[PDB]
Amino acid sequence: TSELRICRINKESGPCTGGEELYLLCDKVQKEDISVRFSTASWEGRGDFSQADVHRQIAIVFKTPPYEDLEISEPVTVNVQLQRLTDGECSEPLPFTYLPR
Amino acid sequence: TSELRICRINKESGPCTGGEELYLLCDKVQKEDISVRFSTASWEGRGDFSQADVHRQIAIVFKTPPYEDLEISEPVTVNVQLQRLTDGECSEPLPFTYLPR
């Protein structure tokens, strides 16, 4: 089906032990009629999650802005947050650290 | 504001050069009245993106299932896809590779 589409899995590697919590982004699905399946030609495994683990989210794709100082010899972790244009009200900050060249 | 909340940034590091495309997950926002802001006490930068870069998405949080063989000496990349319970129709596969212990 084309209706079901996974956009991505936050991580692409993990221990063969499993039990590792991850998240995947995808298109519309029904939390009551959906499941995740790991598999190979002769093996199949299922992701462990409930309906409460299926969240409606907004995703913003953007290119980072160059940092003020391009000659930094050490990492600089700055703030990143959403900000409304109209009233300029920001969200809580989330860290992102710029790396030297 | 508590209305605006970022759940996460796919990456937490990048070159100070900027221009690096990333994506961030967050709660409800208005694509016409929203913006991303990078900053420090005395500096501010803006994420580069348009309305077409704000997507409504579903995110599923789940724990990976242990792989069949826990004694693998080399990485095994298997398939991962959504599958409907009712009609068992799967989505295209996305790779995920199990790592040895």
From Swiss-Prot, chains A, B:
Signal peptide residue numbers: none
Domain of life per record: Eukaryota
Modification note: Phosphorylation at 'Thr-103' and 'Ser-573' is followed by proteasomal degradation.
Mutation effect (residue 91 to A/E): Strongly reduces transcriptional activity and interaction with NFKB1/p50 and NFKB2/p52
Organs and tissues of expression: Expressed in intestine, thymus and spleen. Undetectable in liver, bome marrow, kidney and testis.
Subcellular compartments: Nucleus; Cytoplasm, Cytoskeleton, Microtubule organizing center, Centrosome
Subunit structure: Component of the NF-kappa-B RelB-p50 complex. Component of the NF-kappa-B RelB-p52 complex. Self-associates; the interaction seems to be transient and may prevent degradation allowing for heterodimer formation p50 or p52. Interacts with NFKB1/p50, NFKB2/p52 and NFKB2/p100. Interacts with NFKBID. Interacts with BMAL1 and the interaction is enhanced in the presence of CLOCK.
Known function: NF-kappa-B is a pleiotropic transcription factor which is present in almost all cell types and is involved in many biological processed such as inflammation, immunity, differentiation, cell growth, tumorigenesis and apoptosis. NF-kappa-B is a homo- or heterodimeric complex formed by the Rel-like domain-containing proteins RELA/p65, RELB, NFKB1/p105, NFKB1/p50, REL and NFKB2/p52. The dimers bind at kappa-B sites in the DNA of their target genes and the individual dimers have distinct preferences for different kappa-B sites that they can bind with distinguishable affinity and specificity.
Domain free text: Both N- and C-terminal domains are required for transcriptional activation.
Protein name: Transcription factor RelB
